[PDB]
Structure formats: structure tokens, C-alpha cells
Design a protein around this nucleic acid. Structure first.
Ligand SMILES: [Mg+2]
Ligand SMILES: [Mg+2]
Ligand SMILES: [Mg+2]
Ligand SMILES: [Mg+2]
Ligand SMILES: [Mg+2]
Ligand SMILES: [Mg+2]
Ligand SMILES: [Mg+2]
Ligand SMILES: [Mg+2]
Ligand SMILES: [Mg+2]
Ligand SMILES: [Mg+2]
Ligand SMILES: [Mg+2]
Ligand SMILES: [Mg+2]
Ligand SMILES: [Mg+2]
Ligand SMILES: [Mg+2]
Ligand SMILES: [Mg+2]
Ligand SMILES: [Mg+2]
Ligand SMILES: [Mg+2]
Ligand SMILES: [Mg+2]
Ligand SMILES: [Mg+2]
Ligand SMILES: [Mg+2]
Ligand SMILES: [Mg+2]
Ligand SMILES: [Mg+2]
Ligand SMILES: [Mg+2]
Ligand SMILES: [Mg+2]
Ligand SMILES: [Mg+2]
Ligand SMILES: [Mg+2]
Ligand SMILES: [Mg+2]
Ligand SMILES: [Mg+2]
Ligand SMILES: [Mg+2]
Ligand SMILES: [Mg+2]
Ligand SMILES: [Mg+2]
Ligand SMILES: [Mg+2]
Ligand SMILES: [Mg+2]
Ligand SMILES: [Mg+2]
Ligand SMILES: [Mg+2]
Ligand SMILES: [Mg+2]
Ligand SMILES: [Mg+2]
Ligand SMILES: [Mg+2]
Ligand SMILES: [Mg+2]
Ligand SMILES: [Mg+2]
Ligand SMILES: [Mg+2]
Ligand SMILES: [Mg+2]
Ligand SMILES: [Mg+2]
Ligand SMILES: [Mg+2]
Ligand SMILES: [Mg+2]
Ligand SMILES: [Mg+2]
Ligand SMILES: [Mg+2]
Ligand SMILES: [Mg+2]
Ligand SMILES: [Mg+2]
Ligand SMILES: [Mg+2]
Ligand SMILES: [Mg+2]
Ligand SMILES: [Zn+2]
Lengths: 23, 17, 83, 206, 60
RNA sequence: UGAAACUCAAAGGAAUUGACGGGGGCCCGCACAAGCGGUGGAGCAUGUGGUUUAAUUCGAAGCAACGCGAAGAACCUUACCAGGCCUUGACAUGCUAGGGAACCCGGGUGAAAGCCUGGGGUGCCCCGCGAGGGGAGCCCUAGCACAGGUGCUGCAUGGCCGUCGUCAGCUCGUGCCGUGAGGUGUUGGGUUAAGUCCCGCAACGAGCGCAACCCCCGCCGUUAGUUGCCAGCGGUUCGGCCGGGCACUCUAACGGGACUGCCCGCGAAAGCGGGAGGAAGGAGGGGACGACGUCUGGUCAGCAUGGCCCUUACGGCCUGGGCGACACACGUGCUACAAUGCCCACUACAAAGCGAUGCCACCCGGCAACGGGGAGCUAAUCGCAAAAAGGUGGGCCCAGUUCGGAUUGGGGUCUGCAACCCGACCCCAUGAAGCCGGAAUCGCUAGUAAUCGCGGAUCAGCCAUGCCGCGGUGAAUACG
């Protein structure tokens, strides 16, 4: 869920990138 | 006896500064 | 935390007050306003009077207080609980 | 407190801006200061002429201020010499070539900003407020207007309890956009505070 | 704490982080637009006046 | 039968305009009913009460205070506290006396501010082969007039706003009725979203309101044709890329179009029911617009302003602290408790905006935040930019779990003079409560509710889960 920075869902929410939602 | 609210015990005056 | 590419931060004006003591045989009770300064391994064994906004708290430094800022060792609010 | 500014409400319809120009994001604001500072000087210095509308045009590195004064005898002065000492005073703020026209007033009794100042001075000069409002609204309607409304608010007569006084004649449809309502405001200082004076002239529709 | 802070905004400061917008009309330190150099109040005052080029009460 | 002491400034009659009724009649509003999602429980974000504090600056208080002033509190802001400092002062006008400057680069002390400082060298009109001495942008030293105050009074005020309420209402002129307050008109039958409009009438008109003129959206036209478009032929490294073209789509300016105009049916008429044409039908959907007034409503801290108050300080500069406290209570929210779901890979479809110490293509280093290089764009051209729900494929198998993502340990990144108090983000580890929420209670009648993502203001960065917008998908129900 969106509170989970450690997934693609959380990253879209906080609008950032990383290992779990690269660009 | 000085500035603004709360009052310092003199009419009009408060505690600040 | 600060970019380690940049410099480990001390205000410079406090660090010179130290190195002189080290030199001409420390230690006086050193007072400052640089809460933001990092505890630097030179500082160990001195006591530094850090302002808490109100007073200068005496802080004796030890090998294991090194990673931190001086402000970590002089808290700013006095609490002691409700009741 | 409810009603919207009658002029602000009809920009693009019955009313034109008082500054006309384009400027990019990078210095719209800088211009804006000069403008406000400009009218600062003129509403300051040319109050005694009875000022009514400072129209500031811009093209590039120059300016054209148009002053709408009731008695242009005070503006131009003894032989193009007053209007000069100010066209010179304006350069000291503008920097640019400050080109300054003086435009005649149609009928001063049809300038809402004028009426306001005439009433504000009468209340500044200790005259009966209610009377001054009924008189002002008379002079407008006689000058062939289609409606007029004047509103005084404050410590009228020095009364401790502040009050609203007004008077209205003809018709004033502030909800109608094709109506042409000249609006003006004057402020009136006294020994006991300040009073606001709003004057509404209805000049006919389109 | 007003006039001394209208002045102190203009000063150029020890660090650039200490630079803040103030309204050039009234001096408000809050809700200031960089486009105009005006606060949200003054903005609305000069707007309704027409003294604001090409500004117009939107509605849609 | 029938007093007085004492006490009060009234006690009363009728009638008027209001307000009010657990009086009546006729109406309306997501008012209930009908439904769909939620709040109240949890963890967290923020606002507040309270308490605490050197200070936790000040304001908002039922609806209409409580993600409100605050559309950006680490310093700044800052209005508060502690300390160190300045006293015609940070700022405006004007008057003197001295230096005689101006301004730009230093140095000592000190947390800085400040205090003490060290240099060079100015026209301006001038008598100048002369020593030179005046005067003048503007600086500085003293000395006055004055500045300064986010100190008080929103119960002295202007301005602007909230609100009853987009509710259908509030009035005036003359006439008429009444000793008069007042009444009449504005009531009454019908109709409307509406004091909308029709008929009636001791009234006849007029003004503020409603509606209309303004804006966005829905069909069509004209005008345009690049940076936008690609219908049909020519090339084509297969990209509208090039020839070319402006049909179409779009963009953005000017028009048209709906009027209860037409047919029927009711009716005195206003209108009302139904039908046809038509993109749209009864105001087409949405906005902007807020009557006389109410609340001694809000705001002296945006600003303006009368009066009261401070004057080496209730003013001004600084460093630091606080505004971020936490036995507790409340509001508005975010994320969930799972399978109509969660996860990974691949693959589709928007709209509105922002962008020359800005947006950052693309290449490389890095698991990543990010970093280094590096084209294009003053932007219908280049960039932010991938929209996400969806669709396809695999994985989980009903478990406090591959549900949930708080809390804590460790390791980094960037902005910034500086992230201890007190920043966002990244990765390893940790993996709380929560099994659908007591009494209670909120929103919405259609492209709405719900769900999904995207942008902007402010801004160095950010505590935005806020706010103002944008489109994707798209219901349920209304008896009354
Ligand atoms: Mg208190
Ligand atoms: Mg007096
Ligand atoms: Mg800032
Ligand atoms: Mg600001
Ligand atoms: Mg009676
Ligand atoms: Mg219900
Ligand atoms: Mg809640
Ligand atoms: Mg809760
Ligand atoms: Mg409190
Ligand atoms: Mg408070
Ligand atoms: Mg106050
Ligand atoms: Mg914030
Ligand atoms: Mg601070
Ligand atoms: Mg009031
Ligand atoms: Mg007021
Ligand atoms: Mg108050
Ligand atoms: Mg009424
Ligand atoms: Mg009458
Ligand atoms: Mg009579
Ligand atoms: Mg009457
Ligand atoms: Mg009638
Ligand atoms: Mg009525
Ligand atoms: Mg009535
Ligand atoms: Mg009546
Ligand atoms: Mg009656
Ligand atoms: Mg209505
Ligand atoms: Mg054409
Ligand atoms: Mg209207
Ligand atoms: Mg009050
Ligand atoms: Mg004030
Ligand atoms: Mg005051
Ligand atoms: Mg101060
Ligand atoms: Mg400070
Ligand atoms: Mg706060
Ligand atoms: Mg609770
Ligand atoms: Mg929230
Ligand atoms: Mg973006
Ligand atoms: Mg667990
Ligand atoms: Mg359990
Ligand atoms: Mg788990
Ligand atoms: Mg998970
Ligand atoms: Mg850590
Ligand atoms: Mg920090
Ligand atoms: Mg379960
Ligand atoms: Mg529920
Ligand atoms: Mg709940
Ligand atoms: Mg409705
Ligand atoms: Mg969801
Ligand atoms: Mg956003
Ligand atoms: Mg930002
Ligand atoms: Mg936080
Ligand atoms: Zn302002």
C-alpha cells in the first residue's frame, strides 16, 4: 500500500524513484 | 507592565519584554 | 546527514580555541554558541560550555561522544512531567 | 460586508485598465512599482488640481502618463512651467523619458472619484454629512446622469457610535454589466478618526 | 517590529538563505507573489482597481 | 363593614409593527425518507483545548474557531525567551558646528553584532606658470527638531471579509384609510427556480433585489494553417521523416443556434402536460454575480486611522533557544485492516499548467537517492512527462499473511553558512496497532458520489497526507 516506501506503489505516492520504482 | 497579552497587572499592559 | 563529500563541519572559530589549548597545554573551560559543531576527536578530554538558549551547560567529552554535535548534550526544554 | 468592486467587476466590458502594457515574467513587477510610485507622486502633488485618473502607457524604455485633472490650470502652471518641473520630477523617479499629457474633464459632476473627494472635504470641513450627501447626489442627477449613490461610514458628526449614511437617486444596477457605473473612493480624516466616502455614478448602459 | 524589518528585507544578508520576499506595497511577510511583488491582499486591491495590467477576475 | 405604617414610578386600557408557539394553512432546501461512501475504534499527518515551559509570540470560539490568518517557522521569517550589544538610532524630512568626505579593498578583538581600526583618493564653478582657499552629489563625529513601537482599545473607526442566504425578499413617490404608531401598494385566485408572470383590486408608478447583458462547456459556420494536423498520390534510414497539402483533428478570435418558435391537449390568461424537428428543450450543464439589513460577528498583527501608552527603551542589531514541549482531550485528514486484493515483468489512453544562477533530453558511475559529463528550448517546436486505475502474463492461497507499514538500529544522498533541538529523500535491517470500529455522526441527486493518477501557487529545501485546479473510470437511489 501507498504508505510502503519499499514498493512501486509507495514510490508513486511519495513521487520518488529508486530500486523499487526506477526511471 | 509592558507589552501585549497576557496582562502583567497594570491596565493595558502585558508581560512581553 | 551532511554529504561526506563536503567537509565534516566545525565552526572554525571554536576549533582554533581548542587546538591552542592542546598546544599550550590544555584545558580551560571553553564556552561557545556552536551547538551545530561536530565533536571532533581533538576535543576529547575538554569540557565545553554549550549554550542551551539560556545557560552554558558544562559538557565533558569522551571518545564515544565523537560522532555527534555538541547540541546533542545540552537539551533546550526543561520538562519533569505533568502531575 | 458583501458587495464586489463595481470597476473590478467590469474590466473587459465597461471599463479599461489604468495601466496598458505587456511585460514578460522577468520584469512585469519592476514596471508595476514605477506605476504605483508614479501615481504616488501625482495623487500626492496634484491633489489640489482635483485628480481623477492616472493612465500610464508603456511601449519600451519610455512612458506616457496621462493625468485627468479637473482644473488643468493647476497642472500646466504659469506657462508650461509647473507641468515641466513635474515632467522633470518624474524623470528623477522614472529614469526614462517621462511623456506627460493633461486631459480635460468632461463634467466634474460626472466623475465619481471627484464627487467623493468633494464630499470628503465637506465632512473634513465640519459640514452636515447627511445634507452634503443629498446635495452631491442632486448635482449629479442634474448633470444629466441616470442614477447616483453616495455612502458615508464612520463617526458621523463625531458620534461615538459609528453609523452608515447614504442617499441614492435615479437607478444604480450594480448587478448589470452593461451598466456603466463610475465608482470612486475618498477618505476623510478628522479629529476623531476616519470616514470612508463611496460615490456611485450611473452613466448609462451599452 | 515593522519598519526595521521592511528595511532589513532590502539589505543583502550574510547568507543568501536569509532572503525573503516582502510585499512592496504594504510590507507583509506572508502570501507574497514573486510575479507582482505583491501580497494576496494588495494584489486583490490593485486588481479590482484596474491598476494591474491584463489582470482580470477569472471565471469558468 | 374595612384602614394605616411602609414601599414603588410605575400599575394599567386598546391598538401597531415585529419576533415567537410542543397554533393553523400553502410551499421549498441532500431536511428526512431512499441509497452509496465514510467519520467515531487503529497508527500516523496537521490544527486546537489543556497542561508544561526561560519562552513554548499573538489572533480565530456553536452553526459561520479548530490542514483557520500561515499559498512553505532549521538561521531568515519572528512579532516570544536568554544573553551580548547601538542610542537623531534600521528608515523619513529639516537645521546647525567639525572633518571635509564620496566609494572600494583590508586588519585586531568577539558567537556574531558591535567596539577599536588602514588605507588610498571626488568632481562641481571657480582667482590657477601661484601657495592654494572656498562652494557642492554623498559619507562620517557631535548636537537638535524628529524618527521607531506586530505595545492597548475591532466596545471609538475606514477599508475588506464571514453569515443568515442566491433566500425572495426590502422599499420609495404621489394618492387613499387612520387622532396616531401604521395600513394600503407588497394582500387576494392562478403560475414560476423567483415580489416570474397572468387576472383581480383605492390605488397608479418607480428603485434596490430575481432574470438579462460577462465567462467555461455541448452542435454548426467564417477567418486563419506554424512550432499543430496527415485525407488521397511521390519519395522514405519506415519517425508526418521528406515532396507536398490545410480536407480533417486542433489551436483562437468573430458569428449562428432554443424562442415555449411549431403540432396537439387543459386553461380567462400566465403557464402546464405531451409530441416533431434538432448537437442541445423548457433557465441545456457549470461559473462569476449576493437586496435593505442582521449578528456592538471578524480583523488596531496586511494596510489605513482617533484616542491611551513606551523614549540609552515596550525602539534597533546580533548569536542561541522557542514557535516542533506532552499524564492528557477534541476537530479536519492520510494510510490500512485485504483475494472485487497484494507483488513483479511487459504493454496501452488524458487534461490543465510550470520552465534561460530555469525544465533537463540523452550517455556514463552507482542496487538507489544522487553525481558527472551533455544536446535542445526565450518554448503548439525543446523539457518536466512515466499518467495511474486499466489490459496481458506469471507469483501469493485466507495466514496478523508476499495483508498493513508505524516504531527503532545501521548506512548514505541532496539543498543550505549550517539539518542537535528541528529537513526531505535513498538502501539494508526491524515489521507495532490494526480481523471493518460503543453511544454517536458526515458527505453527495449524474459525469455526481466513490476510486485513479497528474499539475500549480508558496518555495533553497521541506515536515503538502493541506490548499486551488486538471482530466481518467464511473454507480446506487428518490415511494413520499
Ligand atoms: Mg498563556
Ligand atoms: Mg486632542
Ligand atoms: Mg527563506
Ligand atoms: Mg514571503
Ligand atoms: Mg393590551
Ligand atoms: Mg440518510
Ligand atoms: Mg479522524
Ligand atoms: Mg481517529
Ligand atoms: Mg495552548
Ligand atoms: Mg495559540
Ligand atoms: Mg491582538
Ligand atoms: Mg508548512
Ligand atoms: Mg527563530
Ligand atoms: Mg464591529
Ligand atoms: Mg469593521
Ligand atoms: Mg478579539
Ligand atoms: Mg422578511
Ligand atoms: Mg405612501
Ligand atoms: Mg389624514
Ligand atoms: Mg405608508
Ligand atoms: Mg396588485
Ligand atoms: Mg413582503
Ligand atoms: Mg411585506
Ligand atoms: Mg405592508
Ligand atoms: Mg395586509
Ligand atoms: Mg431562485
Ligand atoms: Mg479553411
Ligand atoms: Mg443576477
Ligand atoms: Mg465584539
Ligand atoms: Mg494597526
Ligand atoms: Mg491604533
Ligand atoms: Mg527587538
Ligand atoms: Mg535570531
Ligand atoms: Mg503551529
Ligand atoms: Mg479520539
Ligand atoms: Mg492529513
Ligand atoms: Mg513534476
Ligand atoms: Mg507482524
Ligand atoms: Mg492482536
Ligand atoms: Mg507483512
Ligand atoms: Mg508489502
Ligand atoms: Mg538513520
Ligand atoms: Mg534540522
Ligand atoms: Mg484476515
Ligand atoms: Mg465503516
Ligand atoms: Mg472509522
Ligand atoms: Mg441539489
Ligand atoms: Mg486505494
Ligand atoms: Mg501535488
Ligand atoms: Mg515546493
Ligand atoms: Mg516530521
Ligand atoms: Zn501587501
Amino acid at each position: 500500500g501507498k504508505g510502503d516506501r519499499r514498493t512501486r506503489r509507495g514510490k508513486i505516492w511519495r513521487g520518488t524513484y529508486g530500486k523499487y520504482r526506477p526511471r | 507592565s509592558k507589552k501585549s497579552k497576557p496582562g502583567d497587572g497594570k491596565f493595558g499592559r502585558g508581560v512581553k519584554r | 546527514p551532511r554529504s561526506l563529500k563536503k567537509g565534516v563541519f566545525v565552526d572554525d572559530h571554536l576549533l582554533e580555541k581548542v587546538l591552542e589549548l592542546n598546544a599550550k597545554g590544555e584545558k580551560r573551560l571553553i564556552k561557545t554558541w556552536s551547538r551545530r559543531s561536530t565533536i571532533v576527536p581533538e576535543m576529547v578530554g575538554h569540557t565545553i560550555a554549550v549554550y542551551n538558549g539560556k545557560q552554558h551547560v558544562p559538557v565533558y567529552i569522551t571518545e564515544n561522544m565523537v560522532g555527534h554535535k555538541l547540541g546533542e548534550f545540552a537539551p533546550t526544554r526543561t520538562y519533569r512531567g505533568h502531575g | 460586508g458583501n458587495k464586489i468592486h463595481p470597476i473590478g467587476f467590469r474590466l473587459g466590458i465597461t471599463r479599461d485598465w489604468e495601466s496598458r502594457w505587456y511585460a514578460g515574467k522577468k520584469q512585469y513587477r519592476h514596471l508595476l512599482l514605477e506605476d504605483q510610485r508614479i501615481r504616488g507622486l501625482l495623487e500626492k502633488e496634484l491633489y489640489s488640481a482635483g485628480l481623477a485618473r492616472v493612465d500610464i502607457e508603456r511601449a519600451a524604455d519610455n512612458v506616457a502618463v496621462t493625468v485627468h485633472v479637473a482644473k488643468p490650470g493647476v497642472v500646466i502652471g504659469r506657462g508650461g512651467e509647473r507641468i515641466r518641473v513635474l515632467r522633470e520630477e518624474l524623470a528623477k523617479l522614472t529614469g526614462k523619458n517621462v511623456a506627460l499629457n493633461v486631459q480635460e474633464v468632461q463634467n466634474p459632476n460626472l466623475s465619481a472619484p471627484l464627487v467623493a473627494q468633494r464630499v470628503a472635504e465637506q465632512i473634513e470641513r465640519r459640514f452636515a454629512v447627511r445634507r452634503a450627501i443629498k446635495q452631491a447626489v442632486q448635482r449629479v442627477m442634474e448633470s444629466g446622469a441616470k442614477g447616483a449613490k453616495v455612502i458615508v461610514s464612520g463617526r458621523i458628526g463625531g458620534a461615538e457610535q459609528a453609523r452608515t449614511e447614504w442617499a441614492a437617486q435615479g437607478r444604480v444596477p450594480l448587478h448589470t454589466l452593461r451598466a456603466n457605473i463610475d465608482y470612486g473612493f475618498a477618505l476623510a480624516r478628522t479629529t476623531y478618526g476616519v470616514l470612508g466616502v463611496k460615490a456611485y455614478i450611473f452613466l448609462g448602459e451599452v | 517590529a515593522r519598519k526595521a524589518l521592511i528595511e532589513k528585507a532590502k539589505r543583502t544578508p550574510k547568507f543568501k538563505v536569509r532572503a525573503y520576499t516582502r510585499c512592496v506595497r504594504c510590507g507583509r511577510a506572508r502570501s507574497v507573489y514573486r510575479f507582482f511583488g505583491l501580497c494576496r491582499i494588495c494584489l486583490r486591491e490593485l486588481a479590482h482597481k484596474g491598476q494591474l495590467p491584463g489582470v482580470r477576475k477569472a471565471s469558468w
